Design an enzyme around this catalytic site. Sequence first.
Site, mmCIF file in Angstrom:
data_model
loop_
_atom_site.group_PDB
_atom_site.id
_atom_site.type_symbol
_atom_site.label_atom_id
_atom_site.label_comp_id
_atom_site.label_asym_id
_atom_site.label_seq_id
_atom_site.Cartn_x
_atom_site.Cartn_y
_atom_site.Cartn_z
ATOM 1 N N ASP A 468 0.784 -1.224 0.000
ATOM 2 C CA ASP A 468 0.000 0.000 0.000
ATOM 3 C C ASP A 468 0.833 1.302 0.000
ATOM 4 C CG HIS A 472 -0.204 4.271 3.389
ATOM 5 N ND1 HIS A 472 0.284 3.799 4.583
ATOM 6 C CD2 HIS A 472 -1.399 3.668 3.203
ATOM 7 C CE1 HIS A 472 -0.555 2.904 5.071
ATOM 8 N NE2 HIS A 472 -1.588 2.810 4.255
ATOM 9 C CG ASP A 544 -3.717 -7.458 -2.385
ATOM 10 O OD1 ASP A 544 -2.538 -7.445 -1.974
ATOM 11 O OD2 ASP A 544 -4.634 -6.784 -1.867
ATOM 12 C CD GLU A 546 -9.748 -2.954 0.078
ATOM 13 O OE1 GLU A 546 -8.825 -2.359 0.688
ATOM 14 O OE2 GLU A 546 -10.687 -3.498 0.692
ATOM 15 C CD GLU A 550 -7.303 4.893 -0.222
ATOM 16 O OE1 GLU A 550 -6.804 3.741 -0.083
ATOM 17 O OE2 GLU A 550 -7.933 5.494 0.699
HETATM 18 O O1 LIG Z 1 -13.368 -3.598 15.343
HETATM 19 C C1 LIG Z 1 -12.976 -2.383 15.956
HETATM 20 C C2 LIG Z 1 -11.876 -1.778 15.140
HETATM 21 O O2 LIG Z 1 -12.452 -1.338 13.852
HETATM 22 C C3 LIG Z 1 -11.787 -0.143 13.272
HETATM 23 O O3 LIG Z 1 -12.689 0.456 12.333
HETATM 24 C C4 LIG Z 1 -12.904 0.221 10.914
HETATM 25 C C5 LIG Z 1 -11.940 1.036 10.141
HETATM 26 O O4 LIG Z 1 -10.573 0.815 10.537
HETATM 27 C C6 LIG Z 1 -12.114 0.707 8.691
HETATM 28 O O5 LIG Z 1 -11.162 1.592 8.223
HETATM 29 C C7 LIG Z 1 -10.976 1.369 6.860
HETATM 30 C C8 LIG Z 1 -9.633 0.860 6.363
HETATM 31 O O6 LIG Z 1 -9.444 -0.430 6.857
HETATM 32 C C9 LIG Z 1 -9.707 0.850 4.860
HETATM 33 O O7 LIG Z 1 -8.503 0.473 4.370
HETATM 34 C C10 LIG Z 1 -7.839 0.164 3.119
HETATM 35 C C11 LIG Z 1 -6.883 -0.914 3.395
HETATM 36 O O8 LIG Z 1 -7.679 -2.089 3.470
HETATM 37 C C12 LIG Z 1 -5.934 -1.137 2.247
HETATM 38 O O9 LIG Z 1 -5.246 -2.172 2.922
HETATM 39 C C13 LIG Z 1 -4.782 -3.533 2.688
HETATM 40 C C14 LIG Z 1 -4.488 -4.216 3.965
HETATM 41 O O10 LIG Z 1 -5.624 -4.141 4.853
HETATM 42 C C15 LIG Z 1 -4.102 -5.647 3.745
HETATM 43 O O11 LIG Z 1 -3.644 -6.630 4.667
HETATM 44 C C16 LIG Z 1 -4.296 -7.869 4.911
HETATM 45 C C17 LIG Z 1 -5.115 -7.734 6.169
HETATM 46 O O12 LIG Z 1 -6.041 -6.678 6.142
HETATM 47 C C18 LIG Z 1 -5.901 -9.003 6.384
HETATM 48 O O13 LIG Z 1 -6.932 -8.828 7.365
HETATM 49 O O14 LIG Z 1 -5.006 -9.958 6.892
HETATM 50 C C19 LIG Z 1 -3.838 -10.171 6.161
HETATM 51 C C20 LIG Z 1 -2.922 -10.600 7.306
HETATM 52 O O15 LIG Z 1 -2.785 -12.011 7.513
HETATM 53 C C21 LIG Z 1 -3.330 -8.994 5.302
HETATM 54 O O16 LIG Z 1 -2.772 -9.588 4.150
HETATM 55 O O17 LIG Z 1 -3.026 -5.710 2.720
HETATM 56 C C22 LIG Z 1 -3.237 -4.921 1.494
HETATM 57 C C23 LIG Z 1 -2.015 -4.969 0.616
HETATM 58 O O18 LIG Z 1 -1.811 -6.317 0.217
HETATM 59 C C24 LIG Z 1 -3.559 -3.495 1.850
HETATM 60 O O19 LIG Z 1 -3.768 -2.727 0.657
HETATM 61 O O20 LIG Z 1 -5.213 0.074 1.745
HETATM 62 C C25 LIG Z 1 -5.758 1.375 2.153
HETATM 63 C C26 LIG Z 1 -4.924 1.852 3.293
HETATM 64 O O21 LIG Z 1 -3.806 1.007 3.314
HETATM 65 C C27 LIG Z 1 -7.243 1.411 2.513
HETATM 66 O O22 LIG Z 1 -7.964 1.736 1.314
HETATM 67 O O23 LIG Z 1 -9.733 2.156 4.608
HETATM 68 C C28 LIG Z 1 -10.973 2.687 4.829
HETATM 69 C C29 LIG Z 1 -10.809 4.083 4.385
HETATM 70 O O24 LIG Z 1 -11.275 3.957 3.111
HETATM 71 C C30 LIG Z 1 -11.276 2.690 6.275
HETATM 72 O O25 LIG Z 1 -12.629 2.862 6.383
HETATM 73 O O26 LIG Z 1 -13.431 1.298 8.314
HETATM 74 C C31 LIG Z 1 -14.581 0.707 9.027
HETATM 75 C C32 LIG Z 1 -15.765 1.572 8.681
HETATM 76 O O27 LIG Z 1 -16.917 1.307 9.468
HETATM 77 C C33 LIG Z 1 -14.332 0.523 10.532
HETATM 78 O O28 LIG Z 1 -15.118 -0.579 10.989
HETATM 79 C C34 LIG Z 1 -11.789 0.937 14.316
HETATM 80 O O29 LIG Z 1 -11.339 2.172 13.739
HETATM 81 C C35 LIG Z 1 -10.855 0.579 15.389
HETATM 82 O O30 LIG Z 1 -10.913 1.630 16.397
HETATM 83 C C36 LIG Z 1 -11.159 -0.746 16.013
HETATM 84 O O31 LIG Z 1 -9.912 -1.325 16.427
#
Ligand SMILES: OC[C@H]1O[C@@H](O[C@@H]2[C@@H](O)[C@H](O[C@@H]3[C@@H](O)[C@H](O[C@@H]4[C@@H](O)[C@H](O[C@@H]5[C@@H](O)[C@H](O[C@@H]6[C@@H](O)[C@H](O)O[C@H](CO)[C@H]6O)O[C@H](CO)[C@H]5O)O[C@H](CO)[C@H]4O)O[C@H](CO)[C@H]3O)O[C@H](CO)[C@H]2O)[C@H](O)[C@@H](O)[C@@H]1O
EC number: 3.2.1.39
Length: 717
Positions: A468, A472, A544, A546, A550
């Site tokens: 990512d 970022h 991968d 998503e 972004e």
């Molecule tokens: O439960 C209480 C808890 O919940 C949080 O709230 C949620 C909030 O955080 C969520 O925010 C969104 C954010 O996640 C989203 O992000 C993407 C991001 O996914 C993307 O990332 C991926 C990685 O995630 C990923 O790794 C994999 C991993 O996730 C998986 O679970 O496991 C594997 C490990 O074995 C791993 O491989 O890897 C890839 C690359 O390969 C990444 O690209 O990239 C960007 C940022 O990096 C982003 O687009 O972003 C959203 C913003 O658009 C956020 O919304 O949103 C929810 C909304 O309701 C919330 O529930 C709370 O904030 C916390 O307080 C609590 O702890």
Amino acid sequence: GDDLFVPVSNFDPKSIFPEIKHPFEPMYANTENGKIVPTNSWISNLFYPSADNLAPTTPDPYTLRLLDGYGGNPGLTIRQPSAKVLGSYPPTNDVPYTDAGYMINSVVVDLRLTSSEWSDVVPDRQVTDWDHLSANLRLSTPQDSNSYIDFPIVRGMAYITANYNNLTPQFLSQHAIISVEADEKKNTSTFSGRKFKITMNDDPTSTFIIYSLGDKPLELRKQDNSNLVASKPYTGVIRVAKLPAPEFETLLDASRAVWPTGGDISARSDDNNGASYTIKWKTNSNEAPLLTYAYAHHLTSIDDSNVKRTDMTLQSATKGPMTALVGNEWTLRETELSPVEWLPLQAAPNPTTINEIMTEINKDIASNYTQETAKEDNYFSGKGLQKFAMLALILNKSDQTQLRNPELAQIALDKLKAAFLPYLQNEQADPFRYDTLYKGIVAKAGLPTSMGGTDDLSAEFGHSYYSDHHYHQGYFVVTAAIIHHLDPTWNADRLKAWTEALIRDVNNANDGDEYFAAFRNWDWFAGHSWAGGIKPDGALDGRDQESVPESVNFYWGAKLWGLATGNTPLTKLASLQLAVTKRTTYEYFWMLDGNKNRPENIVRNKVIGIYFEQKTDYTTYFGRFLEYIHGIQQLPMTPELMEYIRTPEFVSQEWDEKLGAIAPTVQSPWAGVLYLNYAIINPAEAYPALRKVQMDDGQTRSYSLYLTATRPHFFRR
Ligand SMILES: OC[C@H]1O[C@@H](O[C@@H]2[C@@H](O)[C@H](O[C@@H]3[C@@H](O)[C@H](O[C@@H]4[C@@H](O)[C@H](O[C@@H]5[C@@H](O)[C@H](O[C@@H]6[C@@H](O)[C@H](O)O[C@H](CO)[C@H]6O)O[C@H](CO)[C@H]5O)O[C@H](CO)[C@H]4O)O[C@H](CO)[C@H]3O)O[C@H](CO)[C@H]2O)[C@H](O)[C@@H](O)[C@@H]1O
Ligand SMILES: OC[C@H]1O[C@@H](O[C@@H]2[C@@H](O)[C@H](O[C@@H]3[C@@H](O)[C@H](O[C@@H]4[C@@H](O)[C@H](O[C@@H]5[C@@H](O)[C@H](O)O[C@H](CO)[C@H]5O)O[C@H](CO)[C@H]4O)O[C@H](CO)[C@H]3O)O[C@H](CO)[C@H]2O)[C@H](O)[C@@H](O)[C@@H]1O
Ligand SMILES: OC[C@H]1O[C@@H](O[C@@H]2[C@@H](O)[C@H](O[C@@H]3[C@@H](O)[C@H](O[C@@H]4[C@@H](O)[C@H](O)O[C@H](CO)[C@H]4O)O[C@H](CO)[C@H]3O)O[C@H](CO)[C@H]2O)[C@H](O)[C@@H](O)[C@@H]1O
């Protein structure tokens, strides 16, 4: 034309970021060739061991696996996915209108290339050389280095090419070999020649052709219902192709003699508001025209004056049918680049909305920037910074946007600076470090404890392991381009160096830059970006991706940086990358009705979900909800996303089929993401909704009203 593959800068990032060596090293790489191991490439799995040796490398249309121990003899495993498996999820109201939740390819040994010498021994693997389009892979007998196979693995290859040296060829399958035709002669169990048409008992019927290009012919005995052993150690090249259909046997015959070993990519812009990139394939000889499979987006953008299209097609892992092209050079054109710069094309809002927008702007500028921009990690900090960068943007371009308030404009710009300054000084919660191993900048948080990290490689979304980076760093680049454009003297030199280290970490277009890997996140063959970085124990479904917006956001920011510093090659490359992104988004990611590249069950989902090389998953990494899945493809809403990338046709199809039913029910911040997306086709209904609903944490109400009120077909509802 003018050349886009020039270095951004040659600033040494060690003056700004403390230096480290990445803790996780490439196990199988030739350390003595001076090349840099790519972190987000389709070849990346090749450099590391994987669980069960099941990490796939997918040049497409073939999928390869190294040394997986099923079928007994280890070697190079080929799978050619003629058909896909759809899986579904347990139904919930979180995702109401879906039947296909994911599409995958069966891990099956269609055909393996190995040796009878490797019955009781496991061969040592190495990646001997590589570029953006290829990798040469050598499997040799341990302690006997002169007994080996070289595999030139190249994007788009129509055959698998295996250079055997002093080993006995063996071809195993997981299927049964029902028939074997040597040299086009038709009952026996031992066969001889230079051509072997073998047919299997699978559904549908896979037919493979094997060619022996060495001096001596080959002699194969049918040992099992699944194995063909040769008579003696062989020296020379053996090629294997899957025959897509009987009427293409002559095509495969004619091109058996020439193989790709790599490719050189270059790019030019032209004063016809266009750009192009060219692939010059590296081959073994030139005795025949080169045969290569192309993706759907290749067919619609290639210059046809030096290549012949065929009718021969095989299915790719996840991008639809590929079509073979004949020729050794591909020029791919984007004739319609984006006109967007800082603002919407109509910079001034509907006059009836100005007081309302100015009231909201005033509120949003009064926000607590510390609490909205000093988040736990870099990502959410970037969303906050860019969202306030937009407000300073439109206020200090009031001669165009008509949002005049000199006092408020200056406070907007001051507060943005104050909040951004800690990131410029690398004094945020998660500071970056420069990595000499993989030649990039990484956040510190995911590093082991001995480097000041939390030991969790998932910290900062995997940013420490190069995941990512464009998601970022996109936010920071946009922010800095806006600061540098509105006030070119504020910290100019540290700003220019810092922002460009970021652009370079993600998008360095020239190996002349000694400090950064080339095109870390962009893939010129696939025509889009990859998100997945180093995945210890293997990325078992490959790279991968998503979020598309972004990724768009980094290439928009790169373009804005190019505008703010007068760098035409940078500005033009960002445009070209945005144009390829747009084309491929509508081929593979955002599916209009009638999309030819997916099963119809997936097409009705409208977005692909999380896209991998080996599967697609209608879900997210943060909750399997419909508004999350469609919402993530809709932020950050910028003029690039609103005016260029997200088209009325798709927005409209998606809204009638999925979102119209759910956006009004949504009681979270995702309501604001959806209704801002809706402002694209129906600003008249969206504007009242954006006055009431909740805003995403990277969204402001004032800016959202501004983008809606600047739609040309806006009217008071
Ligand atoms: O439960 C209480 C808890 O919940 C949080 O709230 C949620 C909030 O955080 C969520 O925010 C969104 C954010 O996640 C989203 O992000 C993407 C991001 O996914 C993307 O990332 C991926 C990685 O995630 C990923 O790794 C994999 C991993 O996730 C998986 O679970 O496991 C594997 C490990 O074995 C791993 O491989 O890897 C890839 C690359 O390969 C990444 O690209 O990239 C960007 C940022 O990096 C982003 O687009 O972003 C959203 C913003 O658009 C956020 O919304 O949103 C929810 C909304 O309701 C919330 O529930 C709370 O904030 C916390 O307080 C609590 O702890
Ligand atoms: O909401 C509360 C909590 O939710 C979690 O959010 C969920 C989120 O984690 C989840 O996303 C899915 C991913 O888990 C899934 O990722 C898969 C990998 O985990 C799997 O890896 C390994 C492989 O590496 C290893 O070698 O072997 C294992 C066994 O063979 C294998 O399992 O990699 C797979 C690909 O190789 C990959 O699929 O990927 C899915 C995408 O297909 C994601 O959907 O998704 C949930 C619903 O969206 C989220 O709720 C949070 O992370 C928690 O912190 C929250 O508290
Ligand atoms: O509600 C979320 C709760 O459950 C957790 O979420 C699941 C998630 O685990 C699931 O992912 C699977 C992948 O694991 C699977 O990958 C395959 C591997 O399992 C296997 O070892 O190898 C093959 C390679 O051939 C992998 O592809 O792929 C399937 C389909 O792609 C995935 O569904 O996906 C669910 C949908 O997002 C998700 O809900 C989560 O971890 C919990 O913490 C959480 O409480």
